[PDB]
A paper describes a structure:
The three largest gene segments of the Thogotoviruses, THOV, DHOV and JOSV are homologous to those of IAV and code for the heterotrimeric polymerase. Despite very low sequence homologies, all domains have similar folds to those of the corresponding IAV polymerase domains. However, the critical active site residues in the putative [name] binding and endonuclease domains are not conserved in THOV and DHOV and, contrary to the case of IAV polymerase, neither domain shows the expected in vitro biochemical activity.
Furthermore, given the high resolution, well-ordered structure of the THOV domain, which is the same for all three crystallographically independent copies observed, it is extremely unlikely that the putative active site region could be repacked through induced fit to allow m7G binding.
Author numbering: 325 to 485
Write the structure that this text describes.
Amino acid sequence: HHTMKIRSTKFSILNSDHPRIEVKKVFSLSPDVQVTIPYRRFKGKAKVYFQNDQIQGYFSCTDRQIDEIKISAPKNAPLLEPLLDICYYGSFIEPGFEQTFGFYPAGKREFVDSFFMHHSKDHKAFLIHMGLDKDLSLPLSPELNWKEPALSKVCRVTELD
């Protein structure tokens, strides 16, 4: 049906220029040794509602770039894992889609599992994707905790109206 799920986070497309498209990415060591690991992404604009338990909101993207995220969440909620679900959903950060994790992948299952392991341990890819701001009135801390105090904040992540 319409709603789709990445881990525990449900996604529902509000509107989009096109349906999600599939990229049949191929990784190779030699002609005889190569895996096909496809991923899905957006072509053009998209606005998508998401929800994970006490956390909900929506985000806007253009192709493989997040334009904005609006979130509603409890104070001091750790937003690491659901944000990664969004990142995977749109294939917004590497490695995990066009790049490997520093070693030739075993297959689809391994590649997806590697994504969440790798980026949980080190999530700067996301910070680079959004940007870090000097404005403190913004809600999301660099450690990706909701409304946590900090000397800098994550760009273009605000609170839902």
